[PDB]
Amino acid sequence: TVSYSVNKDNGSVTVAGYASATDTNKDYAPAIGTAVNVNSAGKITTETT
Amino acid sequence: TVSYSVNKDNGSVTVAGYASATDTNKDYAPAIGTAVNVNSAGKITTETT
């Protein structure tokens, strides 16, 4: 589970942290405040290119 | 009372909905679906001149 914040003015989506049932040791931790991008296949991915 | 619809995809604000406690003959009712802008003085206004 990861939380996305949508800017009301810009319309962009950013990662605003995440919560997991287990500890997860922050292994799957994505960077907070990074712009959210749509992959070519249509998934959600932080990679620009 | 003027009702504005906000498109959450990009943040654009349009005019959609007019309410009047009197008949008002729709004197102050702009056509719905017109993109609203901000005047020089910061007011909320429809013309782009």
- How far A17 CA lies from chain B's nearest CA (Å)? 21
Which neighbouring-strand residues pair with B37?
A: B45
Cβ-Cβ contacts under 8 Å between A and B: the total is 11
**Would you give the distance in Å from CA B8 to the centre of its chain?**
17
- How far B5 CA lies from chain A's nearest CA (Å)? 13
Q: b or e along B10-41 (b: 16 or more beta carbons within 10 Å of the residue's beta carbon)?
A: eeeeebeeeeeeeeeeeeeeeeeeeebeeeee
Q: Do B11 and A6 touch (CB under 8 A)?
A: no
Which string of DSSP letters, residue by residue, matches chain A? -EEEEE-TTT--EEEEEE--SS-GGGTTPPPTTPBPEE-SSS-EE----
